Structure formats: structure tokens, C-alpha cells
């Protein structure tokens, strides 16, 4: 049996590898290389341009935290946007909220969605929900053109190398600010505290220009580089995203595997070296 | 440049790899294979029987949490024991406490200590402290024979395969119970929540037989399998280890890089799937 190994200039000198049970699908789309394999121990794995995007084993950790953090803080969110997230994990978690009336997803690469609908049916099940509307477009353009404003924007991008290059900058955060309701929240995938501290500082810097409350949370997920990933949390009001305003008690949330009321605030309690770095920003 | 790759039956189907800048030292001791290399991005790395034991880049995360969790809860600890920990990282953190009068370390493999004193001088600096007493012995035997009792016992073992095989069982926890003061605390390296849940359940089960309060905390550290490791926290009193009884404010602790007052309790806020597994124990 062969092994898949994740190398990158974005994390030099380290690599994570998974043993391949069988390759399921491979293609070069208009935007990126796409690879799906069944691993021996992490279940099915999606790889985009050589970078692990999700595995069946741990995906719930990232999708639950990215979704339930802003969604438990927002009082009665009705319109939510997902940027990226073609796999549909975020959308799957959003559909659990009965108050939600509309979910827009803006994904540049329709191949990602189609591959997820075929190979990852427990991740892409949300696409069946009548509230979901799909836009195949660069989020950069979608955000300049959208007429609606959103209660919550979730930025579930890949890394700065590739199609997500348009999403890591100051103009992007302006567009997010403008696409949000007066009391709206954005959460965005932000890199690992263990390797990307200069980037975290940059992103916080861009966000603080516009948002009156910028916070950073960390998630444990073994198949992302360094075994964790951050959430850049941006608020328009003074109160921020560290404290949920509700508990997820109904039957739709019985099955949650990572998120809970106490984990929410705990994820914002960062290692001392990081707080030190992001103080004079 | 070549790469070091960490494979193991203890974490099947996955591997973490670091690029080697240069090999520094290699030997087969009486107990295990020892390897020291300079990595390209994680600094110097100690490997025992093919398993990464520490790197310069992230070691502080494990050593600070393992030490400062029990040491901030214990009111005035005077006598502390370290089981394993031949590198001296725990001892380095213990020496910061002026109230401490004695630190015993029981390490089976003197080669580990000697290699750390040569190659890892910023980790093994604590050995110079007059309060430190070294016993080259199986902790299993040391704990049967010791006459003193300790305020805190820190079990900084390697994995269940190798010399640390004697340290993962019910009789071991009895010996820890007996070596502790009436109001004493033990913390012990416990595996990753992402792979070893049956083991975590076993260890908690053994501990709850004897200790009136057994808790589990998680630490983020990129060079351990799955990017995290747990602390099995055992207490003889009703109150447990989740809340510090002091803040580390003096000049000795100015330099801490991971631990802080709020991180302490946050580390005990576990993902929902794990709480679910460890409820009916
Ligand atoms: C698969 S998802 C990663 C974790 C799964 N929740 C990353 C998605 O972001 C899309 N992406 C990347 N750049 C953009 C832009 N610019 N716009 C929209 N979507 C994008 C990319 O095609 C992946 O499908
Ligand atoms: C290097 S340390 C790992 C992380 C660094 N704080 C693990 C040490 O535990 C020792 N060890 C393993 N088994 C035992 C027993 N049974 N007794 C004492 N020390 C042990 C082993 O030799 C390593 O040096």
C-alpha cells in the first residue's frame, strides 16, 4: 500500500502522511488538482492542490466550530453566506438551524461540489435543503456584486496559494464588512498558531481596521498542518464572539461531536506566546 | 536532505515527518534506540525508539502544562517527583518555584539524561539545581521502595511500547496513590483524544478506583501524533486540578510561552465525543 504525503512551502520542513487504501478520483479542474482517496484509518480524504482539505474522521471538528461559534452568538440569523466550503460541511451544520431562511454558498470550483456530492454524501447532504443557493463564482466578485446583506458570513477557504489568493487581503475584509448586517459577524479560516504567526498578525491587522472586535480561536484537528487551525472572528458590535447566546438543545444538534457550550469560549484561550505577538496590533 | 518519518503500530495509517539538517547522535542504549538530529525548522529533536520525544520548537507547551497545572493548584508543594522526564524539561519548570525544597527524578535510562545535558542545554539546565536528585531506576521499583511522600508526582513517560510498559496499569496507580501526601496530586502523560480513546477510558478507570477526582486535559503540540496529547489529572481531595490557586507573577515565570491562568482551565474543556465516551466510567 502506498502513502499520500502533504508537502508545502507554506509549512517547510514538515509533512503529514496518510496510508492509501484506494484512489477514488483524480482530475485537474479549471482551478486546481483534485484528489479523493480512501485512507486506511481516516476514511475518505479530499485533497486540493496537494493539501488535505478534509477527512471523514475529523471534519466535524472544523465544520462544527466554524459554524456553531458565530451561529450561537447571532440571536436570530436569517441569511447566512458561505465563502468556499464546496464540500458542504458548513452548510450541513447551518441547516440544523430552523431560524435560518436562506443559505448562499459562493464556491469558485463546481468540481469540488460535484465530487463532494458523489464521494462525501454525509458531508454534502445539506445541498438537498431548499434554503441553499449555489453561486459558482470567485467570492471576490460575488462580494462586490451581492445586493443582500448577511447575518453571518463564514469564510471556509483553502490556503493563500491557489484560487483562495483573492481572499487574503484588506480589500476582501472591506467587502465582508459591507456584505454584513449592522450587527453581523464574520468568521474566517486563519492559519495555525504553530507556524503562521506573521500571517495571523496581518489578518488581525486588516480586520481591526474595520471591525470593532477582532478575536482568534483555535481548533484541534489532526489532519491540518500542526494539528490545529485558527478562526479569525470579526464583530461589528462591542461584544464579540467568545460567549454563546444560546445552547444547542434541540434534536437537530443531539449528534454534535466537538462543539459544546463550554468549548466555545475555551477555544479563545490562546497560548501565551501568541497573545504576546498579537497585543500591540 | 533526508527526512525523519515517525511510523508506529500505536498510530496506524498516519505518519509525521521532519526534514533533517544533520544527524547529531545515535546509539542503542540498554533500554532503547536513541537519536538526536537538527531539523531544518523545529530545531533539535530527540527520538526514542523511532518516536519523537521532543523538539526545541514546541517542547515548552508540554513541559509548561504538565508542570504548571498541578503546581499552581498545590498550595505550597515542597517535595515533587518526576517519573521519566530524563530530558529535564519538567525539572526546568519546577525549579522556577522557590517554595520547592526537593525534586526527585526517577529515570530508567541514564543515556537520555546525558544526551540531554550535552545536546539540549536549554532543556536540561535544571539539573544544575542543588534541589534536584537523580535516581537511575525503573519507576515501578522506585515507587514500591520510596520512603518519602510527595506533594506532586508528574509522570512524564514515553509510550506503552518500550521501558514505559511498566507504567500503564492499575498497580502503578496504586503506587502513585501511596507515594502521594494525603492532599497530593498526580498528573500523567495520557494519549491523544484523536486516536487512543479506549486507552484514555482504561487509564481513567484505573485512576477512579483510587482517586476521588480524575480529570483529563488536552495540550496542543504539533510534533506529537495528531498534534495534541492529554494529561490524566488525579486528585485525592474533592476539588481537582481544573482551577489554579495562584498566578505565576514573579520574575521566574515572566518567560512562559504557553501556560497562563486562563489556559489552565480551558485545557479541561474537551470535545463532545470524548466527554460522551468518558461519562459512564
Ligand atoms: C474544500 S474547502 C476546505 C475545508 C472543507 N470545509 C475550500 C474551498 O474554497 C474554495 N475556494 C477557493 N478560493 C475561492 C474563491 N476565491 N471563491 C470561492 N471559493 C473559493 C476552494 O475551491 C475549495 O473548494
Ligand atoms: C524523554 S521523556 C518524553 C518527553 C520529554 N519530557 C520520556 C522518558 O521516560 C523514561 N522512562 C520510560 N520508562 C521508564 C520507567 N519505567 N521508569 C523511569 N523512566 C522511564 C524514558 O527513558 C524517557 O527518557
Domains of chain B (ranges, CATH numbers)? 1-57 (2.30.140.10), 58-281 (3.40.50.150)
Instruction: Report how far residue A175's alpha carbon sits from residue B122's, in angstroms, rounded to the nearest whole number.
Output: 47
Active centre residues of B (catalytic): 156
For chain A, after which residues does the C atom lie more than 2.5 Å from the next written residue's N, i.e. where is it broken? none
Write out the three cell numbers for A250. Answer: 434541540
Look at the alpha carbons of B108, B114, B117, B119 in this order and tell me if their dihedral is positive or negative: negative
Classified as helix, coil or strand, A103 is strand
CA dihedral A10, A15, A18, A24 (to 10 degrees): 40
What are the distances in angstroms from CA A78 to CA A81, A153, A180, A281?
10, 12, 12, 33
Residues in contact with B249: Cβ distance below 8 Å, sequence separation at least 6, in sequence order: none
Of all residues in chain B, what percent are helix, strand and coil, respectively (each to 5)? 30, 30, 40
The helix (run of H) or strand (run of E) holding residue A94 is: helix A89-94
Scan for cell 500503564, then name that residue: B168
Write out the three cell numbers for A105. Answer: 454558498
Residue of minimum CA distance from atom 21 in ligand 1: A84
A102-107 and A79-84 beta bridge pairing: parallel
If you ran DSSP here, which 8-state letter would residue A28 be given? E
Nearest to A199 by CA among A241, A163, A169, A162: A169
Write out the three cell numbers for B270. Answer: 474537551
Residue in chain B closest to A13 (alpha carbons) equals B19
Q: Which atom of ligand 2 is nearest to the CA of B85?
A: 2
Q: Do A262 and B271 touch (CB under 8 A)?
A: no
A150-156 and A180-190 beta bridge pairing: parallel
Nearest to A152 by CA among A238, A61, A90, A60: A90
Torsion angles phi and psi, residue A118, rounded to 5: -85, -50
Q: Which of A41, A225, A272 sits opposite B260 (nearest CB)?
A: A272
Q: Which of A16, A262, A273 sits opposite B16 (nearest CB)?
A: A16
What b-and-e string marks burial along B169-184, b requiring 16 or more CB atoms within 10 Å of the CB?
A: eeebbebbbebbbeeb
Look at the alpha carbons of B261, B229, B224, B162 in this order and tell me if their dihedral is positive or negative: positive
Whether the Cβ atoms of residue A193 and residue A231 lie closer than 8 Å to each other = no
Classified as helix, coil or strand, B236 is coil
Residue whose CB lies within 8 A of the most ligand 2 atoms, among B32, B52, B157, for a mutation test: B157
The helix (run of H) or strand (run of E) holding residue A276 is: helix A272-277
What are the distances in angstroms from CA A130 to CA A134, A136, B47?
11, 17, 54
Q: Which residues of B touch A13 (CB under 8 A)?
A: 18-19, 39-42
Ligand 1 centroid to Cα of residue A171, in Å, is: 18
What are the distances in angstroms from CA A133 to CA A63, B138, B212?
19, 63, 53
Whether the Cβ atoms of residue A219 and residue A230 lie closer than 8 Å to each other = yes
Ligand 1 centroid to Cα of residue A208, in Å, is: 24
Whether the Cβ atoms of residue A97 and residue A71 lie closer than 8 Å to each other = yes
Q: At what angle do helices B197-208 and B170-179 cross, to 10 degrees?
A: 50
Is residue B249 classed exposed, middle or buried when 0-12, 13-18 and 19+ CB atoms within 10 A define those classes? Answer: exposed
Look at the alpha carbons of A47, A51, A220, A85 in this order and tell me if their dihedral is positive or negative: negative
Instruction: Report how far residue B274's alpha carbon sits from residue A259's, in angstroms, rounded to the nearest whole number.
Output: 11
Residue whose CB lies within 8 A of the most ligand 2 atoms, among B108, B115, B189, B190, for a mutation test: B108
Ligand 2 centroid to Cα of residue B86, in Å, is: 6
Scan for cell 464546496, then name that residue: A86
What are the distances in angstroms from CA A126 to CA A120, A186, B73, B78?
11, 21, 46, 58
Look at the alpha carbons of B148, B149, B151, B157 in this order and tell me if their dihedral is positive or negative: positive
Instruction: Report how far residue B206's alpha carbon sits from residue B228's, in angstroms, rounded to the nearest whole number.
Output: 22
Residue of minimum CA distance from atom 13 in ligand 1: A164
Look at the alpha carbons of B268, B274, B278, B280 in this order and tell me if their dihedral is positive or negative: positive
Angle, vertex CA B67, rays to CA B61 and CA B68, nearest 5? 85
Chain B: give the shortest CA distance to residue A4, in Å: 9
Whether the Cβ atoms of residue B233 and residue B70 lie closer than 8 Å to each other = yes
Instruction: Report how far residue B171's alpha carbon sits from residue A121's, in angstroms, rounded to the nearest whole number.
Output: 47
Q: Do B12 and A40 touch (CB under 8 A)?
A: yes
Judged by phi (left if over 0) then psi (alpha if -120 to 50, else beta), residue A240 lies in: left
Strands (DSSP E) along B57-141, which ranges? Answer: 79-84, 102-107, 132-136
Annotated binding-site members of A for spermidine? 156
Instruction: Report how far residue B125's alpha carbon sits from residue B73's, in angstroms, rounded to the nearest whole number.
Output: 25
Whether the Cβ atoms of residue A157 and residue A138 lie closer than 8 Å to each other = no
Number of Cβ atoms within 10 Å of the Cβ of B279: 7
Look at the alpha carbons of A110, A113, A118, A119 in this order and tell me if their dihedral is positive or negative: positive
Q: Do B227 and A218 touch (CB under 8 A)?
A: no
Q: Which residues of A touch B17 (CB under 8 A)?
A: 5, 14-17
Instruction: Report how far residue A152's alpha carbon sits from residue A67's, in angstroms, rounded to the nearest whole number.
Output: 9
Residues in contact with B162: Cβ distance below 8 Å, sequence separation at least 6, in sequence order: B31, B32, B48, B49
B79-84 and B150-156 beta bridge pairing: parallel
Classified as helix, coil or strand, A279 is coil
> Bridge-partner residues for B218, per DSSP?
B230
Q: Which of A18, A39, A263 sits opposite B271 (nearest CB)?
A: A263
Whether the Cβ atoms of residue A72 and residue A94 lie closer than 8 Å to each other = no
Whether the Cβ atoms of residue B47 and residue B37 lie closer than 8 Å to each other = yes
Write out the three cell numbers for B47. Answer: 527520538
Q: Which residues of A touch B12 (CB under 8 A)?
A: 19, 40-41
Alpha helices in A120-196 (DSSP H): 139-145, 170-179
Q: At what angle do helices A197-208 and A170-179 cross, to 10 degrees?
A: 50
Write out the three cell numbers for B255. Answer: 518567560
Classified as helix, coil or strand, A101 is coil
Whether the Cβ atoms of residue A241 and residue A187 lie closer than 8 Å to each other = yes
Residue of minimum CA distance from atom 24 in ligand 1: A86
Write out the three cell numbers for A60. Answer: 466535524
Instruction: Report how far residue A159's alpha carbon sits from residue A7's, in angstroms, rounded to the nearest whole number.
Output: 13
How many CA atoms does the CB half-sphere of B169 hold within 13 Å? 10
Angle, vertex CA A244, rays to CA A66 and CA A134, nearest 5? 35
Number of Cβ atoms within 10 Å of the Cβ of A253: 17
Question: How many distinct helices (H) and strands (E) make up chain A?
Answer: 8, 12
Ligand 2 centroid to Cα of residue A138, in Å, is: 52
Whether the Cβ atoms of residue B261 and residue B243 lie closer than 8 Å to each other = no
Classified as helix, coil or strand, B220 is strand
Q: Do A19 and B13 touch (CB under 8 A)?
A: yes
Residue whose CB lies within 8 A of the most ligand 2 atoms, among B36, B120, B163, for a mutation test: B163
Instruction: Report how far residue A271's alpha carbon sits from residue B220's, in angstroms, rounded to the nearest whole number.
Output: 9
> Bridge-partner residues for B215, per DSSP?
B233
Whether the Cβ atoms of residue B174 and residue B141 lie closer than 8 Å to each other = no
Nearest to A114 by CA among A46, A171, A163, A194: A46
Active centre residues of A (catalytic): 156
Of all residues in chain A, what percent are helix, strand and coil, respectively (each to 5)? 30, 30, 40
Instruction: Report how far residue B45's alpha carbon sits from residue B48's, in angstroms, rounded to the nearest whole number.
Output: 10
Strands (DSSP E) along chain A, which ranges? Answer: 3-6, 14-28, 33-39, 44-48, 51-55, 79-84, 102-107, 132-136, 150-156, 180-190, 213-220, 228-235
Amino acid at each position: 500500500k502506498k502513502w499520500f504525503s502533504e508537502f508545502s512551502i507554506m509549512w517547510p520542513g514538515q509533512a503529514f502522511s496518510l496510508k492509501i487504501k484506494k484512489i477514488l478520483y483524480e482530475t485537474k479542474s479549471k482551478y486546481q488538482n483534485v484528489l479523493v482517496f480512501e485512507s486506511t484509518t481516516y476514511g475518505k480524504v479530499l485533497v486540493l492542490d496537494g493539501v488535505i482539505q478534509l477527512t471523514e474522521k475529523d471534519e466535524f471538528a472544523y465544520h462544527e466550530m466554524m459554524t456553531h461559534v458565530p451561529m450561537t452568538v447571532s440571536k436570530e440569523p436569517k441569511n447566512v453566506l458561505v465563502v468556499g466550503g464546496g464540500d458542504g460541511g458548513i452548510i450541513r451544520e447551518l441547516c440544523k438551524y430552523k431560524s435560518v431562511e436562506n443559505i448562499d454558498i459562493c464556491e469558485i470550483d463546481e468540481t469540488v461540489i460535484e465530487v463532494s456530492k458523489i464521494y462525501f454524501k454525509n458531508i454534502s447532504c445539506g445541498y438537498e435543503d431548499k434554503r441553499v443557493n449555489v453561486f459558482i463564482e470567485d467570492a471576490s466578485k460575488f462580494l462586490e456584486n451581492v445586493t443582500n446583506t448577511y447575518d453571518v458570513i463564514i469564510v471556509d477557504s483553502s490556503d493563500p496559494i491557489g484560487p483562495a489568493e483573492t481572499l487574503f487581503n484588506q480589500n476582501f475584509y472591506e467587502k465582508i464588512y459591507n456584505a454584513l448586517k449592522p450587527n453581523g459577524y464574520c468568521v474566517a479560516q486563519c492559519e495555525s498558531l504553530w507556524i503562521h504567526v506573521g500571517t495571523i498578525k496581518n489578518m488581525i491587522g486588516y480586520a481591526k481596521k474595520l471591525f470593532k472586535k477582532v478575536e482568534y480561536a483555535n481548533i484541534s484537528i489532526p489532519t491540518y498542518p500542526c494539528g490545529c487551525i485558527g478562526i479569525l472572528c470579526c464583530s461589528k458590535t462591542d461584544t464579540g464572539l467568545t460567549k454563546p447566546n444560546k445552547k444547542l438543545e434541540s434534536k437537530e444538534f443531539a449528534d454534535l461531536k466537538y462543539y459544546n457550550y463550554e468549548n466555545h469560549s475555551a477555544a479563545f484561550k490562546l497560548p501565551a506566546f501568541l497573545l504576546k505577538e498579537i497585543e500591540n496590533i
